[PDB]
Structure formats: C-alpha cells, structure tokens
Amino acid sequence: DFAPKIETINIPTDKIREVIGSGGKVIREIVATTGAKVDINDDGVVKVSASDGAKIKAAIDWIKSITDEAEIGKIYDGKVV
Amino acid sequence: SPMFDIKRKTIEWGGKTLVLETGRIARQADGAVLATMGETVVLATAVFAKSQKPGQDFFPLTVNYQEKTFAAGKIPGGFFKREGRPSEKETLVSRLIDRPIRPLFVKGFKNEVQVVVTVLQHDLENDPDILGMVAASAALCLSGAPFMGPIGAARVGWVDGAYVLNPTLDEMKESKMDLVVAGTADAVMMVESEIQELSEEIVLGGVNFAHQQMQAVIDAIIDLAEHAAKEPFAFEPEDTDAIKAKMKDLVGADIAAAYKIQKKQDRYEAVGAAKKKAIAALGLSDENPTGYDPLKLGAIFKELEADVVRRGILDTGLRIDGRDVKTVRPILGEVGILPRTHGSALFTRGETQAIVVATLGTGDDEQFIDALEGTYKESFLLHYNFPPYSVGETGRMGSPGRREIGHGKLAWRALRPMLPTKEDFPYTIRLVSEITESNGSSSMATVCGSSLAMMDAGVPLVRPVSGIAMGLILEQDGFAVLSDILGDEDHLGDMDFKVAGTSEGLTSLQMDIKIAGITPAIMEQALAQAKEGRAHILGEMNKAMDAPRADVGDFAPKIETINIPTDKIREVIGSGGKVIREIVATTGAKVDINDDGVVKVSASDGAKIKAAIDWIKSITDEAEIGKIYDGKVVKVVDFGAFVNFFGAKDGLVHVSQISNERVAKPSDVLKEGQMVKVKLLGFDDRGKTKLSMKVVDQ
Amino acid sequence: SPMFDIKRKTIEWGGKTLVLETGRIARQADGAVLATMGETVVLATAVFAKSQKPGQDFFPLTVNYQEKTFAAGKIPGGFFKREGRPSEKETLVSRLIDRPIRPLFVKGFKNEVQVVVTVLQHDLENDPDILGMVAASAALCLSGAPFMGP
Amino acid sequence: KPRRGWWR
C-alpha cells in the first residue's frame, strides 16, 4: 500500500480538450478535487494515481462522465426505468 | 547451509528492539553486520587492508554513510533518477560515525580501513544515523581489525524534563534538544548536539544519560562478537617508550630552555637545533643500526614537543602565546563592513577572523532537501568557507569539503535555536562565513560573527549567541582546561570542544575526546569555564550590536505575512490559479500559498505589499465571528444606528441595544461619523446584522 | 590595536574613488589588499611558498577569481543554493587576471604562488574584474614575492 | 569456547 497505484484507462482521442479544458482549467479542478494525479498522453491514454483506491475510482468515474456517451451501440446492459 | 549466522536479536532498547545480523550478507568483507531498529535497516561493512602502505605516515580511515532512496520507496528527483554525490546528511553522518572511531585503532596501526554503511529501509520513525553508528561499530569488532572496544551511540531528546532515549522522528518534533553521543565502555568519545537553550547541567545530564543508555548496546556487540568475530588481526601496538626516552634525555632539557624562549626566534631556533642535533645522534644511522630510521624519528620529536609543552601548562597556566588557561584572546567585532549586503560582519579574535554576511530572500530562495524522512524545504542556509590563504597556504578552492561542511553545520546547529519564527520574520536568510584567518576555532568565530551579521541585517534574533573553542590537557595527577584554544593547542589537548549558546543556556555543544577519564566532574568544571569565556566573547559582540537593527536595507526586500482562515483557499487561488495570477500580476507582489492558511507577500515596495494584503483581506474578510469590533456610525435614526466594521457590509445597532437604562430618541451618541466599538449579536432575520454596545463588556 | 593599517584611499580615478585597505583582513596571507571602487568590493590575497618543490620544472601559479552571490544580495539558483563550480565569468576573469602577471615573476622563480580574489560587494555599476586585477596586483607587491613591478 | 577479541 506504500507505495501506490496507479490505475489506467483509455479515452477516445477526440475528447482531449474537454478534459484538459482551456489552459488546464478542468484538469487542475479534477486533480485538486479527487486528490489524484492525472495525465495525459495523446493516444487517449489516462493514468490516474494516489495512495487510495477511493480517490482513483473517484477520478476515473469523473473522467468517464465527461468521456462517456457512445453509442457506438454496440449492445449494452441496463435496467428498465 | 550457505550462511552460518548468528545474530544478537535480544536488546529491546529504550522502547525499540534492535537486531544485529551477521553471517548472511557480505561475507567477503571482514565484518558485515546488518542492524535493524524497528523497521529502519542498515548494512555496515568494514574492510581493512592486511599490508600497510610503504610510505605511510598517517592512518588512512574512510567511512561512507550512504542512503539509497528506495529505503523509503522513492526514486531520486535527479535528472538521472539515480543517486550520486553525497548529501549534506550523507556527509554529515559519515563524519559523525568517523569521529568517535578514529582514535580507537591501536596506536601505530596504519592500514587502509574503510567502513561503509548503507541505509536499506527507513521506517520514517527511527533515524538511521544512530543505528548506523552502532552498526559500523558492530561490523568492525567483528572484522578482527585492531579497533579497541565496541563503541555505542545514543541520541537523547528533551521532553517535559525527561531525557528520552532515541526519540523517533515524531518525538523529536516536540523536544528542546537533539543531543547525539557516542562512546565506549569507559568514556564518551564524541558529542554533537543542537540545543533549544538549556543549561550546562541539563545538557551534560544529557551526555550521561546517553552514556548509560548505550551501555546495553556496547555489551550486546560484545555478545555477538563473542561467537562471530573473525580471528583478531595480530598487530604489535607499537612501543615508542624505549626510543622515546632515549631522545628525551638528549633534548628534554634543550626544549625546557627552548620553548621558554619568548623571542619567536630561537623559540623555533632550539626547534631546528633539536631537529639537526638529534636527527643525527641516533637515526637508523649512518653508521650504526640503533636507533630508528630518520622517518619515524620525526613523530617522536613531534610527540615529545607535546609532553614538554603540556607539563609546562599544568605547572603555570602558561601557554605558548604566554597566556593563562583561562584568558580569552583579543576580540574585535565590526558590523556593516560592506553595507549593501543585507547584513555583514567582520568578527575577529586574536588570529581567527571571519567575514560573515547575511542575505534575506523569499520562498523561491528556500532549498528542497529531498530527504528520506520526507523531502522538505530548509530556509536556513549557513554556508561555511575555509580558504587556504586563511592559514598562509595554497590549494583547493570550490567544492567545499567534509569539515567545511561539518563546521558550517556546527555553527548552524548553534543558531537555529535563537531564530525568529517564520511567523515573526518570514525570510530565508543565507549567511556565508568566509574564514580569512584561522588559528582558533573559525567554526566558533563564524557563529559569533553570524549572530552579529544577522542583527545588522535586521533579524529578531531572540537573543545573541557566542561560542568558544575549548581544550583539556589531562594527567593522572593534575590537568588544565584551556579557554579559546589555538590551532596548536588542539593538536595536543586530550579533549577539545566547542560550546555555543546565549546567556540563558546552551544552543550547541560539540565535543571530541581522545582519552578515557573525563569524569562528569571534570566536564562540568569545563563548561563552567566555557560559560565564563563565551559569555565574555558575548560581551564584545554587544559592543557592536546588543540588539537587531529596527528594519532591513531596502535592497533587499520585504516580505510581509498574514494568516487567513484555511477554508478560504480556493477563493484566493481560483480555478487553476485564475485569481492568484491576476492578483500577483496587478499588485506586482509575490504571493503564496501554504495550507495552514499562511500567506507571505513580497516585493521591494511597502506600497505593493499593502495593496496585495488589502486585496486578499477583502476576499478573506467577513467575520463575525463577532467578536466585538470598531467602526463609525454611517447614519442614525429614531430607530437606531447603522455603523461600519468596514467593507460596506454595515450592521444595525437597534434603537434598543444602544446605551441601556434609557435613550428616549437615539441622539445619545448620534454623530454621523463618530467611531465606536460594537459586538455582533448575529445576523438576525433575514441575512441582516444585529449588533449592540456592551463596550464594555460581557 | 589588532590591525595596523594602512590604506591608500587617495586616488579618485577617472570619476570614481578607489580604495586599497590592507593590515585589517587576512593577515595570515602574505599580501591581502581590500580594494573598493565606489561600492564594488573585492578582497585579493596572494600567498606564496617559501620552499620550491623538488622536481619543479615550471612555475606553478594559480589565480582564483570568485564571486559570492551575496555581494549582490542574492542566493544562488542552484538546487543547493550554495555556489560551486566556477562560472564562465569567474573562469574568464581568472584568466584575464593571470595573463599579465605570469611573466612578471623573476626569471627562475618556481615557487608555488596562489592569488585569490573574491568579490564581496557589487554595486551594479563598477564591474569588479578591473578592480580585481588591480587588487591582485596590490595584494601581490605587498607579499614580498618576486613579482616585478605593480 | 569463546572467540576473542580486540574489544576484548
């Protein structure tokens, strides 16, 4: 547990701006809040890190909300509302 | 099995268990213990040469204390992410380990010996230095090398009023003392400390605490050694006496009426005499075997000068310079020599002068000390520099050495106590000390000069600090304690030591003993005299400062500081620095930052700093609290009074809660603009602001 | 008194006054002048060996011109915030000071000699190099070493 | 039988 993860995921490349934001606007906000280190690449690869699994999940789940929507479709699971 | 250990695990040591593994790792060395203190882990290896070098005039000993970053699961911040040139701490422990040892090798023994200690695991609690000293020790005894008696070491702290053994990192945070000590079964050998203004008794009481408290470890090492050390290495502890006595009676009177020579002339003249004369009469010969070769015949004379000078000083406190064991040398302080430099001083003492100059800076000028404990930022930067011309020689230059560092540390250890808090004084103060003359303790002369150079710079040094170099000739019968020793006087005393502090206790004590017998009685008498000396040197310092300059020189800068409630951080920083950059760009002042809600604001102008501060407060203000406050009525009304805690955000003093007893119509203190004091009852319905006058009070 | 200076203060020099203090600092060297040009301040020390080395085929001379950052109230931008390996300028003045001198030691003289100059105050106007050369010079003549003519 | 020793 000392030391740390370090969890990683991919995002469609054409989403870069939206997560970085103008001059880092969104990224810094995301990093400050979740308490996790984020970056960055360009093949759409995101590595997220800190000591807690809690902070990493927080971050990942956040990013996915900005990143999600696809459809595609692409079968999927869900529940009747 | 490979590996045939072997390990004294026993020893819980003042709260913590200590292990000593040998037999498993680095068997190829002569001794290699692996010590453990809770979770902190260091491997010590001693290897020593079995020949002696041909032209070998000194004992070559070398210690390398080294910290691998992985011991605290990191990867170096180096551009190369490997660790290289030794740190301050690496270099400073290495010295601290080396010090007590060197003396303890059998007289005569001149073989190459190299102890390496390497820190493999740091549990962020147990500091590895103390462990490492122990380990070195262990590893050595095990080697069989001629290294007289295992040596222990203990760090002591000061909590409540209890000497506490080996205060872990945390326990240190709340101590008024960092007194490290190493010694044998018989006396302490060395002492390096850092003291938060404590008295001789409390401090030396420290020493003796440590002496006992290591006694467990010394015994332990032996236990291990007993069934684990290598066959001890046979070396004839060289006997000089035979030939030493023979040269004595050829010259032993020729020096009594030689040193007695007041006139520096023959005073050396007799020297060269003896030299020529004796070098001849006995000297491997030509013809004529007996006596010893003209090589080792130097040493004897060298030695013999000692035995002569030393007798001469116990009978009559009359030294070489012809002064009494108690008499300190002429001092002359001098401040603001070369103004322009934030604080300058030319302290000088007989023939030991330093130029010392202070330099204020910002947080940008702090130094990241990427340590294993935890990478951190030091804002107190003593840099010591000892150039060859300072003793009339040539050489070297740049790339400061092990002592150049140990000394500048010794001095820094003797000032950090008397420093204003980043609260009173939010600066980073450098301080290089350039020794321009040495002959006495430049290391002491530096601190004194700093204490000065710093007041000149404008520093709330809570008090000023002095230091004295000290000596100690010791025979079975009598003995002298030398105040303010020369360069020579050291190279002959059986103990030497630097005492530093203020006139309300000690700030640093460093000692280095060479022989057993320094009873705690002899010690106290020693600091006694030191107390006299140092509080005298202090006398002369005040004759050039006595208290800080009111302010600093306009070059360089303030540097003004304030606190804000912590939960306001975001609002001043803004998203990704949005607000902070805007504030810094506009006011022209440097701002940051912390997290305890501490803001330091800086530039050259008081105007820009006030601008910034006043700005931040507007974003920061609003509280209430309430918490009485001052202000002025804005308007009054047969209804009450509206007033100002400042920031428009007025409040109302209800026509009711004005003056008590009776007010008819609120023309009591009705003066549009008249300042009064008021407490906020609380922003009553709605987001309103009730508030009245018990001025005063509750 | 300690210190028995001694100092040619006279000399205003093409607009600027030049001081040369000796007797007060680094008496332990053979010569140690402390020159001043307005506010720029440098200490020069010359120490030279009284023996000559045994196998001594050349004249060993070494000059170290060095600038402490505090002379202009700073703290080095070095990760160690102490100043170390010599700069271009440090190295370049050192050469510039060394050049004119070397020739001027009495033919044959092969003793170890080491002039150190150190800049203590820079007034951002007077460049210390020129001063420093002068200082070296002064400090040397003072040393008694066989160094022909200031 | 004990080893010894320079310590001793």
Residue numbers in the entry:
A (entry chain A): 552 to 632
B (entry chain A): -1 to 696
C (entry chain A): -1 to 148
D (entry chain C): 890 to 897
Authors' description from the paper:
Caulobacter crescentus PNPase was co-crystallized with a short peptide corresponding to its recognition motif from RNase E in two different space groups (P63 and R3). The asymmetric unit of the rhombohedral crystals contains three PNPase protomers, while the hexagonal crystal form contains a single protomer. Although no electron density was apparent for the KH and S1 domains of PNPase in the rhombohedral crystal form, clear density was present for these domains in the hexagonal crystal. The KH and S1 domains were manually built into this density using as guides the NMR model of the isolated PNPase S1 domain and the X-ray structure of a KH domain from human vigillin. The three KH domains are positioned over the entrance to the catalytic core like an umbrella, with the RNA-binding GSGG loops (residues 572–575) forming a secondary entrance aperture. The S1 domains adopt a splayed conformation, and the conformation is constrained by the crystal packing. We suggest that the S1 domains are flexibly tethered to the KH domains, and that they potentially could manoeuvre to capture RNA substrates as part of a molecular fly-casting mechanism. The RNA-binding surfaces of the S1 domains face the molecular threefold axis at the centre of the PNPase trimer, and it is envisaged that S1 domains could clamp down in concert on RNA targets. Crystals of RNA-free PNPase with recognition peptide (KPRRGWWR) revealed clear density for the peptide in both the hexagonal and rhombohedral crystal forms of PNPase. In the hexagonal crystal form, the GWW peptide additionally forms crystal packing contacts with the S1 domain of a neighbouring molecule.
